[PDB]
Design a protein around this ligand. Sequence first.
Ligand SMILES: Nc1ncnc2c1ncn2[C@@H]1O[C@H](COP(=O)(O)OP(=O)(O)O)[C@@H](O)[C@H]1O
Ligand SMILES: Nc1ncnc2c1ncn2[C@@H]1O[C@H](COP(=O)(O)OP(=O)(O)O)[C@@H](O)[C@H]1O
Ligand SMILES: Nc1ncnc2c1ncn2[C@@H]1O[C@H](COP(=O)(O)OP(=O)(O)O)[C@@H](O)[C@H]1O
Ligand SMILES: [Mg+2]
Ligand SMILES: [Mg+2]
Ligand SMILES: [Mg+2]
Lengths: 517, 517, 517
Amino acid sequence: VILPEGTQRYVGRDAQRLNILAARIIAETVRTTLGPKGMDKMLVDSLGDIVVTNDCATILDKIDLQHPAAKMMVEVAKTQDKEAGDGTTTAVVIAGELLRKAEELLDQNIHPSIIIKGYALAAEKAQEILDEIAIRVDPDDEETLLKIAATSITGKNAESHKELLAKLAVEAVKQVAEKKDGKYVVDLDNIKFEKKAGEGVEESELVRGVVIDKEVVHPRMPKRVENAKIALINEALEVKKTETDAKINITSPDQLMSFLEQEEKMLKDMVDHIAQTGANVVFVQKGIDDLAQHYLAKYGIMAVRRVKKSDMEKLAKATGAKIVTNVKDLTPEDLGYAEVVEERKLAGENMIFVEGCKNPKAVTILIRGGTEHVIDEVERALEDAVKVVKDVMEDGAVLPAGGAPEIELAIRLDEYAKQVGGKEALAIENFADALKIIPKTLAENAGLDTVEMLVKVISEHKNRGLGIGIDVFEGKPADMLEKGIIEPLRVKKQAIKSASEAAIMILRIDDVIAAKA
Amino acid sequence: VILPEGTQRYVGRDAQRLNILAARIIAETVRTTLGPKGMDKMLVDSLGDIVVTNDCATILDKIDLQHPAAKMMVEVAKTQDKEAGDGTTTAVVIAGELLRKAEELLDQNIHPSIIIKGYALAAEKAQEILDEIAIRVDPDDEETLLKIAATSITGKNAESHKELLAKLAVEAVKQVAEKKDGKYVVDLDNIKFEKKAGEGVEESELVRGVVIDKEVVHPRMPKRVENAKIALINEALEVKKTETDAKINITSPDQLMSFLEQEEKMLKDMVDHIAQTGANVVFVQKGIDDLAQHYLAKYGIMAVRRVKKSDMEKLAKATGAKIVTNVKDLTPEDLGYAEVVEERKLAGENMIFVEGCKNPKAVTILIRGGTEHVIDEVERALEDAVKVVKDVMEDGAVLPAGGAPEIELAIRLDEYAKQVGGKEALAIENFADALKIIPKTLAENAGLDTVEMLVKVISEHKNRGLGIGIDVFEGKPADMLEKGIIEPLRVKKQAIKSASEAAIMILRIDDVIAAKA
Amino acid sequence: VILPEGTQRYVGRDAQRLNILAARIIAETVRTTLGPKGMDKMLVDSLGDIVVTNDCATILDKIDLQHPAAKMMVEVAKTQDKEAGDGTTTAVVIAGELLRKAEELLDQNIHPSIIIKGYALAAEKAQEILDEIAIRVDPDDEETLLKIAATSITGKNAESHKELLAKLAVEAVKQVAEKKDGKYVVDLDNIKFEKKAGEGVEESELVRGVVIDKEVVHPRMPKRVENAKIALINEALEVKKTETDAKINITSPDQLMSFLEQEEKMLKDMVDHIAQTGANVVFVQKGIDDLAQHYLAKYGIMAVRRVKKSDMEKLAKATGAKIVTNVKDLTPEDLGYAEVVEERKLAGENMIFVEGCKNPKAVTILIRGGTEHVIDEVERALEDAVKVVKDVMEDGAVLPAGGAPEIELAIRLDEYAKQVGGKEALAIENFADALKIIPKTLAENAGLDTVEMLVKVISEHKNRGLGIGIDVFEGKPADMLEKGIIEPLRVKKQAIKSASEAAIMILRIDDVIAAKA
Ligand SMILES: Nc1ncnc2c1ncn2[C@@H]1O[C@H](COP(=O)(O)OP(=O)(O)O)[C@@H](O)[C@H]1O
Ligand SMILES: Nc1ncnc2c1ncn2[C@@H]1O[C@H](COP(=O)(O)OP(=O)(O)O)[C@@H](O)[C@H]1O
Ligand SMILES: Nc1ncnc2c1ncn2[C@@H]1O[C@H](COP(=O)(O)OP(=O)(O)O)[C@@H](O)[C@H]1O
Ligand SMILES: [Mg+2]
Ligand SMILES: [Mg+2]
Ligand SMILES: [Mg+2]
């Protein structure tokens, strides 16, 4: 035939109209969760699985989106989460608004070309205004580093212990953080999270070491070692075989024995190699024969087998040990140190705690809570908390929260509009207005009076200054800086990038061709 | 088309309304089993299996719940059972009730935000008041521990012998109970239950050792050993083979014989290493060749094979014996002591009793009973019995029963309401009123006049003091302390935690998105 | 019967009329993307996968065309992309327009023969006019080469950084460029693109070397070499085996050790051959045994395994190293140089950067961007920018853009129409009119007044000259030469070639016989 049936297509009005609608729908689905007073969502997976969260990234991800334009909104939160960690709801909400105000300009008959260009100018000029209004802080000033982390957690379910969790996140990042060129550089892969049900979120702690979900491989091995000299062996403590096909031909009785003894020997020799270094704790990545388990036990050496490769590396960065491929070449300089390596039964499960490490380059945060749900959400809260701390340490700049920056951008980006003038100025002014859904939906989710409230905020801000935003807890405008309610300068800069590009990318699609599914 | 067809979604009122309804429905399904006079449910699964219990946890679990919000109730009972072991029905009922009174506040148009904050202040203040009014008892007062256990057994079917069971339970937990740092620590995993049909629940006893469902592996071995020196071998008593592939090449007739003999020897040598330690009782985790069996029999040693790893660990803890991987290194110091080790044919089934151990660190409770159901339910009773005894030894605090803690919580929490004031006060007052479903549904299941009866109890309590609660056996208020009817301070502190958490979790969800169920 | 059932057929009018319709349809589909102001399309394939692009080649290829004649319009962009690399839209648009004005002549009863012939003449004469009017430039003029590239990128998405991309594109081709026979010859296979999400498009860069998506094979190997002496081994660094079937037969215990040691040596000997050359970095196409890795690690050599054949060759060309099949013959002369070979983590991804090379005959462009889409589209832009800069260096002849060349071919080709006269004159006249969709649909996509604009231009061009065309950013005619807005003389020559070729191909089909479509 001509073009496959059960294949739809839209152009101009249609195309853009549908795309903007789908985009806006998704955006409004999450805006109900923006801020400290935002709500939660219960996502019921087809397999019966239940996820209750405040996280935009998680929601957009779990929800099965069909419309293409809506899936693109997932990329917004996806990029925001991977660049600033926090503000995923914000980026998607602003992208939807930008598209709503944009369609308005389309209805007015303004060429997409003009809207796009005016949006780009507004987007580019916002980065500029933010880089400018940003409050340059001291990279490790623990004071504000504690605020950033806290402000972040106060936006989710777990704000109940914003105090503790903030502290654990600033402490965790400060430890693994690296600086050898002048500024910091944080590899968050160096902060493992351990979630165990039971207890309260109160019992959550920072383990300047590592936690592994394995047991001590032999009954007779120490279930605890004091000042451990740790060995990370990535070789199988078992009877090696030749790459070349080989088989034994027993020809006389005495051989059954001689051979077995020959292997015990090989086995024991490997173990001996490990002991001679003075190592009392060994984490093996591959397997461990039974005899080798026995010899290791007799030397009073604690051994764990089948360790995840990801675990081995965490152990390496935490204890200072060096992973080794050949036991024969293992030396004491390869061994790492842990103030205590013990096997504890946490919530019925046995785990190995490698704590009290020297100056760990990798750390673990043990999360405790009543239910699976409480745990999962706290991990989420923390990941954002950690990610914002990472931003402030690398950037060294912060901003007030509660829509204070978008209000600055609105008020200001409208002047830029005048200067630009023309059709573009229309897009620029609309862009500046779209930016108000943050202060707006913040006061809305809080039960406040959207209309009236949004008037006081722009009032104060115009008077008092850059620090004026809305405090959902106060129910009125306030100086966010004096209240220590702040956020990373990177989180805002990135929301604007993510949203404006998602907006412009849609304002550019004049034809949609979807086949049959 | 944002979502796939066949996907349902609800928002605002709908969401909450349905969640609360599904929660309340499940709650009312179990409330009929609350207290001593509670009723039992019969659960028939698709496979035809029939379960008859009073236990909330089993019911919420066996029943196939589908609505999401209703499953989040299963979690409440799960957390409760994993923390205080008892009060599962109580936590679930107070959750459904907390939500019902919560919706009433929603109907009045009170922002969910307000209800959540007020419910949190109520839950927080409730803990505080419980910590206070808590009757601090002596961590090992045989007296109150015998009570806590009995008050518990009386709530279920098994109260006919609340006498025996409560004794077996306090006795059993005291034996395995471990302390050496000041306070007790109980690992209930060191208490195994053994259920056997026949006889009367009366024949249930505490074996200060371990019962194993295996038989003496050889005909000619001893079926009974006085003062046994016990060996725990976790190695196979069979012809070892090399890791490296190998095969025998018989070249001459005289080889057939000599090779077999060479294996008999290997076998006998292993048996010899065991006999030379003095051990007359061997429990092997793996298998035992037929010859190793024969040699073991000649030395008059009693052996059992294929012993469960969980069993080995118990015999190890119960007899002081150490588990060995190599028979070559078994010393007499690895052996353990059991006053008597005998194979008894308990109800047509052969089993092995290791009794009269020195000081057990693990102990078994043998359960007898007419039917399979009698047995199962008694075990369930015992489990909550052992779990509450564990609570007091670790906590050292108790409270009166019959909803007396809640009546006190109600009266007191309400005052708190006044001082807090505002809309929160409406939430607090309601939270407090919700707690009354315990006394309420206790009198109800009993068959008493709820309305009237609940007026009396709140009266007595206001006068006579914190110990006044309802006594379903008295049909009137009573001083629960003088009656000896009490429960762990943990059970109540945990009910409030669980229920209030769940109530708030659900009160936060303003959107539900589901696929296939 | 005669012909298979469900087999359609068309003749004369039908056949030709349908084919021309199908062809025109596809053409009108892509024309909305032509030029700087062209719009993008959203393509959702059967598996939900989303492709958002401006590229014609991609759109015709992703869309599932069913009609035969429309599938042939794909070959047009296919051929165009393969010979000039740019103007794929231009070629398809002109080919449909050609087929339109051609049907007019068919309706007029002019025999297909006359149209084909007059079209072939209009095409032959078209090249002639181009080769002539062509603005001959210096094969390596840095100036114009930057223009040709920036002009190409402007017509797409990433024109927001036309600046940078232009630069990288010129450098990249100059480097890999080969010219010993007088003029240049560029093998674009020597330019590899590397896409990694994250950062801005600002961070995109040129890597005078290669970038490989592999990591260092052993934990103990250097993660960075300063003045690498790279070795390229296409041999498996593992225990070799005889082609003839073989198997070791162990006949005594000492053998288990002697045989493993024999293989260790073999392995160690290969690594010795690699080290004895002074090579501190080795890339191996096949695998590397575990021991071979250990020796390699001890010697302080950085090794990578399983490297792509395509990568090996890019390294050979980037470093000057020679690939080797037998380590035994590796010499220091087979090694290459790299100012730095380091393993970096880009987007949580581990990659090896062989940068700083001497005179790389192969080079890599690293593409950075917010979303997956941003990147894929920037790569597309670069492939065109690089393919056009390739044409200019090999051809050394540019042209003005903005339809300037087509307007010139139109005016001119009409004269030719006169002198040829007769029926063919009508075909040559219509062919020259067809070439106007370019200036037409450029002004249209821009949102200008087609009719009116197309007149100011045919005018200005007539009075000012060859360099007059439409400037979509200017919204009016302009001298494309003064604006630097130009394109390869090859792009235009191949467009005409491709279009007319196709148009005539369809005009010659008077019967279509299909089985199922
Ligand atoms: N105390 C506060 N009062 C009002 N708004 C706040 C307060 N704290 C944080 N916010 C705002 O709430 C938003 C973050 O809400 P959240 O639910 O976490 O979504 P997101 O994914 O965008 O971080 C930010 O705009 C932030 O400024
Ligand atoms: N003799 C009694 N008189 C009145 N109430 C009692 C008595 N014994 C126990 N209760 C109450 O019954 C409740 C426990 O009932 P039960 O069916 O076992 O459910 P749960 O899972 O909550 O333990 C507790 O609130 C407790 O105070
Ligand atoms: N600044 C400009 N103003 C008007 N037309 C331009 C400009 N730059 C390039 N063009 C034209 O746009 C066309 C290329 O647009 P493009 O979208 O890349 O499609 P194609 O596949 O034909 O390259 C060419 O005809 C070219 O002359
Ligand atoms: Mg957040
Ligand atoms: Mg009970
Ligand atoms: Mg182009």
